[PDB]
C-alpha cells in the first residue's frame, strides 16, 4: 500500500524500517474482536517506546472463513505471496475440519512458507489461576519442528486403491508382516530427517546461547520409533557437538566418558562444564517428559522436539501455568527471515462479536513479533503492562470466573487497561 | 500335572483352579527388588482372603538381559509358549534401546499374544504427594489400543536400501510431494484399522456399562491424521451406535439432531439421555485432552484411544497421582482370556538391589491380576491395605521425601507394612 515501507532481509537478517508494513490475518470466530484490541495495544507500545519515531502500517490479507466468503478460496495464493514478500505477519485463529475436509490452513501456511520452527515460550504470570501447585517453576521455550513428521499429511484411507497399493508394496517388496489388520487399515507416513532436525536444533541452540539458557532437552520416543524419533535424538547430539563443541556439553559425550572412565568421572565432567557456563544438551523420552514437566519443571529450559510431540508438549505446558487462552506462538524460518506470529487457541465462535474474548494470546504473539523486529523496548512495555494488569485482576471473563474479587471487563476494555497501565 | 494347575478358558471366561500356576518375568533394574515384596503381599492377600483354600504357584520365565545371558535369545520361544499356555502372567520392566538395538520386548509380548487392550486405571490414593492442587478430581480408566499404530515397528532408516525403495514408491507411484527432505529422511508407517479400533472401543464401552461409568471419551488427533486417528474417532462412534444404540448417546448423534432439528432439539435429547442413564460417547482432540485432564479432569471417566496417544495420556495422568512408582497396567485380550500385568515404567536403576524402590506399581498390577482371576476379595484386601498404609505415611523414599512427617521405609519393609495392614 501507499503509506509504510517493506521490511527486507539480507542473509536471514531483517532490515526493518521505522514505518514497516505488517500483514495480518484477522482470524475466524473471535479473531476480529481480538484483533481490534491487540492491534491497538501493540500500536500504543510502539508510539510510547519510540516517541513517534516508529509506527506500524497494518495490511490485511485473508484466510479462513473471511477469505472463503470474500474470494471463494480458503487460502488465496495472494495471501501467501504477500507474506512471502513482506516477510513478517501476525494472525488470529483459523478453522480446521476433523476426519476430512481440506487440510489445516494453519499447517498449509507453515509448510508453504517453510516456517520450520514453531516457537512456544511458556512462563507463569503472577495472578493467573492454575491447576498446579507451583506454576512459577515453569519457564521453558519450546522449539517444535514445523515442516515434517506425521504432519506431512501423507496418508491413505481404508478401502482406497492407494492404501491397497501401499500395503501391497510393503508386503511384497519389503516383506512387512507387522500390519495387524491389513484389510481394514488406514495408513499414515511419518518422515523425520537429518536436514529437518539439524535446522531446528541449530535454532534451539542458537536461542539458548543468545538468551543465556542453561540447557536444551531433545524430546523423542526413540525406543519405539528408532529411525525417526531415535534418529532425531542422535542427529541433535551430533549437530550440537559438530557446530557448538566449544559452548556445549552433551549427554552423548557423558555416555562416552561414563563408558571409558566410569560415572563418577562423567558426573564430575558435567558439573565442571556447567560451572564453566557450557550449555547442557540432554534428552528425555516423550512419555516420561510429560510427567517431568509436572513434577520437575525446573530441570527444563529450552526444549527441542518434533512436530507431533511439540504440539502435545506445548499444550500440556500452557495448561500447567493456566495459560491455555493466552499462550503466544511464532512460526519462523530463521534462514529466510520469514515469520508468522499467531494466536495459539481456537476460534471460540460462541463469543464471536460479543467483545469478551481474551486477546492476550495475540497480544503476546505480538510481543514476539516486536522482539523479532528488534523493537525490544516496545516488547518490554507490553510484557510489563500484561504482568501488572493480570496481577490487578481487571481481566476478561475466562480469568475473572476463576479468580476471587476480579473485575471482569470486555476484550476492548482489557486492551484499554493494558494501554492505561503502560506507564 | 503336579501340585499347581493350569488356568483354562471356556469361550472367553477364565476357569481358575484354586492353586494356579502364574508365570512371571522378574525384569531389568529394580524389577527383582519389587518382585520380592510384591509377590509376598499378593500371597498374603490370597491367604488372608480365602483362609488357605487358595495358593498361587509362581513360575519364572525369562526375557530381556536375563534370557540373553542364559540362552543367547532376548525372548525365548519357551517364554511365549509358557505365557500362552498358562494364560496370565505378571512382569517387571524390560529395557528397550533407543535409536537401534532390539525392538521392544514389552511390545513384542503384546503383539505375539494379541493383548489388544492396555488397561490403565488412574485414581488418587489419599496421602500420595501430587504436583497439582486437586488430584482427587482424577478418576479415569484408560483403554489404550495395544496392537497397532506406530508401535507396529514398521520403519526404515536414512541411508537404507529399504527407505530408498519406499520413498521412491511414494514419490513415483503415489505422486507424493510432501516429504520435505527425501534425501535424509527415515520413514515410519502408521496403521490404524477398523478391526483394531472396534475391538478396543467395544471393550471400553463394555467396561463402562459393567462398572457404571458415565462416559467414554475417544481421544484422537484426527484434524491432522484424518485417515488413521480421524478414522479411529469415526469407527468408535459408529461401533457405539451400531452395537450399543439403546445404551448410549453419542456426540455424533447430538450433531445429527442439530443438523436435522436444531440446537434445542439436540440439547433436549442429550438431557433426556443423561436422565435415562445412557452412557455419553464423546471425543477430545489429543493436545486439548492433555490440557483438559489438568483443568477439568472430572469431565472424563473411561477413555478410549490409540497406542501412542494412550502411552502419552497415561503417563501425563499418572504424574497427577503418584507417577510410575504406583501406576499399574494390564495387557488383556478380552476375547481369549490371555493377559499380562505390569508396571508402566522401569528404572531408578541406580537403586537396583538396594531395596529402595516403590513396589506399589507391581502390587497394584497384581490387584488387576486378582480381579481378572475373579478373586475380588483378595484384590480388595490389597487395595484397602494400600490405602491404609499410604495414609499412615509409612512409605518408600519416592513418596517419603515429598511428604511431611512420613516414615521412610525400605521396599521390603513397605511390603511387610501392607501385609500388616491387611484387614
Burial B272-303 (b: 16+ CB within 10 A, else e): ebeeeebbbbbbbbbbbbbbbbbeebeebbbb
- Indicate yes or no: CB of B133 within 8 angstroms of CB of A134: no
Q: Which of B421, B392, B367 is nearest to B127 (CA)?
A: B392
CA distance B305 to B200: 8
Annotated catalytic residue B287: yes
Catalytic residue, chosen from B33, B62, B91, B151, is B151
Q: Which residue matches cell numbers 491380576?
A: B369
- Write phi, then psi, for B290 (nearest 5 degrees): -60, -25
CA gyration radius, chain A: 23
- Write phi, then psi, for B217 (nearest 5 degrees): -105, 120
- Residue A149 DSSP code: G
Is residue B413 packed enough to be buried (19+ CB in 10 Å), middle (13-18) or exposed (0-12)?
middle
- Chain A CB contacts of B188 below 8 Å: 189-190, 192, 225, 227-228
Q: Which residue matches cell numbers 519389587?
A: B34
CA distance B217 to B293: 12
- Write phi, then psi, for A212 (nearest 5 degrees): 60, 30
- Chain B CB contacts of A224 below 8 Å: 96, 104, 107, 150-151, 153
Q: Which of B286, B278, B277, B317 is nearest to B138 (CA)?
A: B317
Query: Which residues, numbered 182 to 211 in chain A, qualify as contacts with chain B under a Cβ-Cβ cut-off of 8 Å?
Result: 182-196
Sign of CA pseudo-dihedral A368, A371, A375, A377 = positive
Distance from the Cα of A391 to chain B's closest Cα (Å) equals: 20
Distance from the Cα of A18 to chain B's closest Cα (Å) equals: 36
Domain B1-423 matching CATH 3.40.718.10: the answer reads yes
| A253 contact partners, CB below 8 Å, separation of at least 6 | A241, A269
Cross-chain CB nearest to B193 (options A156, A181, A311): A181
Query: A102 — contact with chain B (CB < 8 Å)?
Result: no
- B349 labeled part of a ligand binding site: yes
Interface with B, mutate which of A178, A282, A317, A349 (most B CBs under 10 A): A178
CA distance A150 to A312: 13
- Indicate yes or no: CB of B294 within 8 angstroms of CB of A311: no
- Residue A355 DSSP code: S
CA distance A277 to B289: 38
The 3 state secondary structure assigned to chain B is CCCCECCEEECCEEECCCCEEEEEECCCCCHHHHHHHHHHHHHHHHHHHHCCCCCCEEEECCCCHHHHHHHCCCCCHHHHHHHHHHCEEEECCCCCCCCCCCCCHHHHHHHHCCCCEEEEEEECCCCCCCCECCHHHCEEEEEEECCCHHHHCCEECCCCHHHHHHHHHHHHHCCCCCCCCCCCEEEEEEEEEHHHHHHHHHHHHHHHHHCCCCEEEEEECCCCCCCCHHHHHHHHHHHHHHHHHHHEEEHHHHHHHHHHHCHHHHHHHHHHHHHCCCEEEEEEEHHHHHHHHHHCHHHCCEEEECHHHHHHHHHHHHCCCCCCCCCEEEEECCCCCCEEEEECCCCCHHHCCCCCCCCHHHHHHHHHHHHHHCCHHHHHHHHHHHHHHHHCCEECHHHHCCCCCCEECCHHHHHHHHHHCCC
User: Least CA distance to A116: which residue of chain B?
Assistant: B180
Extract the C-alpha cell encoding A113: 512458507
CA distance A288 to A296: 11
Annotated catalytic residue A165: no
CA distance A395 to B59: 63
Give the method used. X-ray
- Chain A CB contacts of B196 below 8 Å: 180-181, 184-185
Number of Cβ atoms within 10 Å of the Cβ of A63? 25
Beta-bridge mates of residue A90: A24, A341
Coarse DSSP helix, strand, coil percentages of chain A, rounded to the nearest 5 percent: 45, 20, 35
- Write phi, then psi, for B119 (nearest 5 degrees): -95, 120
Q: Please tell me whether residue A23 adopts helix, strand or coil conformation.
A: strand
CA distance A14 to A337: 6
- Residue A3 DSSP code: S
CA distance A103 to A80: 16
Query: B242 — contact with chain A (CB < 8 Å)?
Result: no
Is the Cβ–Cβ distance between A188 and A166 less than 8 Å? Answer: no
Is residue B2 packed enough to be buried (19+ CB in 10 Å), middle (13-18) or exposed (0-12)?
exposed
Q: Which of B85, B79, B80 is nearest to B9 (CA)?
A: B85
| B79 contact partners, CB below 8 Å, separation of at least 6 | B25, B61, B62, B63, B67
Cross-chain CB nearest to A294 (options B111, B189, B319): B319
Query: B288 — contact with chain A (CB < 8 Å)?
Result: yes
Catalytic residue, chosen from B311, B334, B356, B398, is B311
Query: A349 — contact with chain B (CB < 8 Å)?
Result: no
**Domain coordinates in residue numbering, chain A:** 1-423
Distances (CA, A) of A131 to A37, A317, A318, B293: 28, 11, 11, 10
Distances (CA, A) of A379 to A38, A371, A384, A395: 13, 6, 9, 20
Annotated catalytic residue A51: no
Cross-chain CB nearest to A156 (options B147, B181, B227): B227
- B345 labeled part of a ligand binding site: yes
Q: Which of A331, A332, A295, A335 is nearest to A316 (CA)?
A: A295
Query: Which residues, numbered 142 to 161 in chain A, qualify as contacts with chain B under a Cβ-Cβ cut-off of 8 Å?
Result: 147-148, 150-158
Distance from the Cα of B52 to chain A's closest Cα (Å) equals: 41
Rounded to the nearest 10 degrees, the angle between the axes of helix A411-420 and helix A376-392 is 110
Distances (CA, A) of B74 to B96, B152, B298: 11, 18, 42
Is the Cβ–Cβ distance between A205 and A214 less than 8 Å? Answer: no
Kindly state the helix (H) or strand (E) to which residue A59 belongs, with its residue range.
strand A57-60
CA distance B395 to B414: 6
Distance from the Cα of A378 to chain B's closest Cα (Å) equals: 31
Is the Cβ–Cβ distance between B186 and A192 less than 8 Å? Answer: yes
The 3 state secondary structure assigned to A85-126 is HHCEEEECCCCCCCCCCCCCHHHHHHHHCCCCEEEEEEECCC
> What resolution, expressed in A, was reported for this entry?
1.5
- B350 labeled part of a ligand binding site: yes
Beta-bridge mates of residue A60: A24
Extract the C-alpha cell encoding A260: 571409558
Amino acid at each position: 500500500m501507499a503509506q509504510g515501507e517493506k521490511i527486507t532481509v539480507s542473509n536471514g537478517v531483517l532490515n526493518v524500517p521505522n514505518n514497516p508494513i505488517i500483514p495480518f490475518i484477522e482470524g475466524d470466530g473471535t479473531g476480529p474482536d481480538i484483533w481490534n484490541a491487540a492491534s491497538k495495544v501493540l500500536e500504543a507500545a510502539v508510539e510510547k517506546a519510540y516517541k513517534g519515531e516508529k509506527k506500524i502500517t497494518w495490511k490485511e490479507v485473508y484466510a479462513g472463513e473471511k477469505a472463503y466468503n470474500k474470494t471463494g478460496e480458503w487460502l488465496p495464493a495472494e495471501t501467501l505471496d504477500v507474506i512471502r514478500e513482506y516477510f513478517i505477519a501476525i494472525k488470529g485463529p483459523l478453522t480446521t475440519p476433523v476426519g476430512g475436509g481440506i487440510r489445516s490452513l494453519n499447517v498449509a501456511l507453515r509448510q508453504e512458507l517453510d516456517l520450520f520452527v514453531c516457537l512456544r515460550p511458556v512462563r507463569y504470570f503472577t495472578g493467573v489461576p492454575s491447576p498446579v501447585k507451583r506454576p512459577e517453576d515453569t519457564d521453558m521455550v519450546i522449539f517444535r519442528e514445523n515442516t515434517e513428521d506425521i504432519y506431512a499429511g501423507i496418508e491413505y484411507a481404508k478401502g482406497s486403491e492407494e492404501v491397497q497399493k501401499l500395503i501391497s508394496f510393503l508386503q511384497n517388496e519389503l516383506n512387512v508382516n507387522k500390519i495387524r489388520f491389513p484389510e481394514t487399515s488406514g495408513i499414515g507416513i511419518k518422515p523425520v530427517s537429518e536436514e529437518g532436525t539439524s535446522r531446528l536444533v541449530r535454532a534451539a541452540i542458537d536461542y539458548a546461547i543468545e538468551h543465556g539458557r542453561k540447557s536444551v532437552t531433545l524430546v523423542h520416543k526413540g525406543n519405539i520409533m528408532k529411525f525417526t524419533e531415535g534418529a532425531f535424538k542422535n542427529w541433535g547430539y551430533e549437530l550440537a557437538e559438530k557446530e557448538y563443541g566449544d559452548k556445549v556439553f552433551t549427554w552423548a559425550q557423558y555416555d562416552r566418558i561414563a563408558e571409558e572412565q566410569g560415572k563418577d568421572a562423567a558426573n564430575k565432567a558435567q558439573s565442571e562444564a556447567e560451572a564453566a557456563g557450557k550449555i547442557i544438551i540432554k534428552d528425555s523420552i516423550a512419555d516420561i517428559f510429560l510427567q517431568q514437566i509436572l513434577t520437575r519443571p525446573n530441570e527444563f529450559d529450552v526444549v527441542a522436539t518434533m512436530n507431533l510431540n511439540g504440539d502435545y508438549i506445548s499444550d500440556a505446558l500452557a495448561a500447567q501455568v493456566g495459560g491455555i487462552g493466552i499462550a503466544p506462538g511464532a512460526n519462523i524460518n530463521y534462514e529466510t527471515g520469514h515469520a508468522i506470529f499467531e494466536a495459539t487457541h481456537g476460534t471460540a465462535p460462541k463469543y464471536a462479536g460479543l467483545d469478551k474474548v481474551n486477546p492476550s494470546s495475540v497480544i503476546l504473539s505480538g510481543v514476539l513479533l516486536l522482539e523479532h523486529l528488534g523493537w525490544n523496548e516496545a516488547a518490554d512495555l507490553v510484557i510489563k503492562s500484561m504482568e501488572k494488569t493480570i496481577a490487578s485482576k481487571v481481566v476478561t471473563y475466562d480469568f475473572a470466573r476463576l479468580m476471587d474479587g476480579a473485575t471482569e471487563v470486555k476484550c476492548s476494555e482489557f486492551g484499554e487497561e493494558l494501554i492505561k497501565n503502560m506507564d
